[PDB]
Symmetry: D2
Subunit: 115 residues, 4 copies
């Protein structure tokens, strides 16, 4: 029920091998590690979680943009891109978090569907 | 070798039933109709053309954003969104033209791959 | 009543010395030249028109993104960027057309105020 | 040396009276409050800091997008928008952090000039 997709606006390509860390806000207001992974050759990251495990909560999807651009030997502006949202509070939904990256800019959108 | 995808930044959903017209610049410098279609329930428009027909040229992908937003009963700013590019000039490529829509803004990117 | 602003998402800067041409749609559906200029050091292009000249109608703002990128040694995807909209006197009176450029992407918004 | 500008892609306007909080990363990796304010009628927030105070380091700009949308009667997706970056004295000296808001999307760029 959670997928992350990342595209590269400089290369005109998927953003491959982008590290993504997902956190969930705990009872004590700390960010607890929830899941992580890397984008594939398609720019997509599938299989982060399950419908059982992806309960209601406030989630943070941290897209490691600096590490991405540095691995390409480019000096970027941002440390990361974060997307923070409440999920599943009206029951289970499916979420795609998409991001488009440039060295000094990024854009994100969500696609939320009810299965 | 050509796919168009449109998302709605207000609804957090695919932009369904968006009309898309593709033109190709003719020898006389006019825009010749090349292909057209509508986005599906996924926001994607597949099958516009073929690798035989999608020759080198300058192409214009016109995304009928005003018609989209008016069909939803919203008064938008832009008449359409255009994406104009040279295609296949180093041999055949596959192109995805993606757009993200709001009433007063849009963003587009291209993903170009070599099959 | 019309200002155009262009930014560069690769360098994190204004997009300076970018050619911008504005057209008005004529009765016969052709695009008539209306105003033009080059963005300044701030990425802004002021003084394109006046209230008296800027009547309701459909306008196209064409931004010469291809020349911009090539002058920076980058091959870009687009031939140019276009922003086509209707000026409406029932809405606010000043229009800012902003664009954010990358080699394979562009984003634009309208900021329309009184 | 730091200005934050927020625009609304739904209304085609500045995003007015939006709360913005700036933090600096401390030695212990916590976020220390640094500056805050609300955007003006132009969507801009000026005067957050001074050159003397704005030393190299990692900063976070948090924009209270959720309150903004709810005050307009819209349920938005995000809890807030964050922009996290490093200030580097080897680059240009003035930073503008711009954000463009929609209910389910945001876009941001940095304009860094001398
Ligand atoms: C076109 C765009 C604009 C602003 C932000 C983003 C993330 C995009 C974008 O690349 N969206 C996008 C989302 C999905 Br889901 C896709 O399968 C593709 Br192709 C593009
Ligand atoms: C942050 C952004 C996202 C998508 C598209 C655009 C054009 C922008 C942007 O850079 N907007 C912007 C608009 C004005 Br008016 C400004 O004075 C600045 Br500085 C940035």
């Amino acid at each position: 029920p959670l997928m992350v997709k990342v595209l590269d606006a400089v290369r005109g390509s998927p953003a491959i091998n982008v590290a993504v860390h997902v956190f969930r806000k705990a009872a004590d207001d700390t960010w607890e590690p929830f899941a992580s992974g890397k984008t594939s050759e398609s720019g997509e990251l599938h299989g982060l979680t399950t419908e059982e495990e992806f309960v209601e909560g406030i989630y943070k999807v941290e897209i490691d943009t600096k590490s991405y651009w540095k691995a390409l030997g480019i000096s970027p502006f941002h440390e990361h891109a974060e997307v923070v949202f409440t999920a599943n509070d009206s029951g289970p939904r499916r979420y795609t978090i998409a991001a488009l990256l440039s060295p000094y800019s990024y854009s994100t959108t969500a696609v939320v569907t009810n299965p």
